[PDB]
Amino acid sequence: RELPCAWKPVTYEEAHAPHYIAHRKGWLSLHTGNLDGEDHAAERTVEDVFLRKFMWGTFPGCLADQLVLKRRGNQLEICAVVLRQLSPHKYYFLVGYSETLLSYFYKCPVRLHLQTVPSKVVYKYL
């Protein structure tokens, strides 16, 4: 009517700040490229960016929390956390689809490790 009358949940990853990455958080992607003497760090970074974009675009609104991309040898393990909103048959379809498509795009044995939670696991409210 007149002026003087007038006058967010966060996950553990979201809650903590960038200056805690080696103190309270960890690294979502884990590989040997950045170690001293190792090579191909940029290729791994590009692969990581494409992996995250693809996984978020192929599981729209299903991913509760960020991906974790692990590499052992030439294996590529996508540990994802999703919700229980989508039907299990569609989850299996998408799992097989993504596994095959990423294996043939990167020429390595990709594998995917869905973990369903009932809902977002809030840590604080910011």
Binding site: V46, F50, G57, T58, P60, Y97
Partner: protein, 69 residues
């Protein structure tokens, strides 16, 4: 130098495969040019970028097929 040192150096150079015939600094550039792959033929040069044709077209093809948002 000496006679002896010159001959032993020129023989050890023949055993280990270095330049036998005496040469100068400017001419030694050929050995270096042919000992290392040129900068344009290194994989960090000609493959510096991701393709960006496959990456972008694939997303388009995936969306047209209704498998990607």
């Amino acid at each position: 130098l000496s006679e002896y040192a010159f001959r032993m150096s020129r023989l050890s150079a023949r055993l280990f495969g270095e330049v036998t015939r005496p040469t100068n600094s400017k001419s030694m550039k050929v050995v270096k040019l042919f000992s290392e792959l040129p900068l344009a033929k290194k994989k960090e040069t000609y493959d510096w970028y991701p393709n960006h044709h496959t990456y972008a077209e694939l997303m388009q093809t995936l969306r047209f097929l209704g498998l990607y948002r």
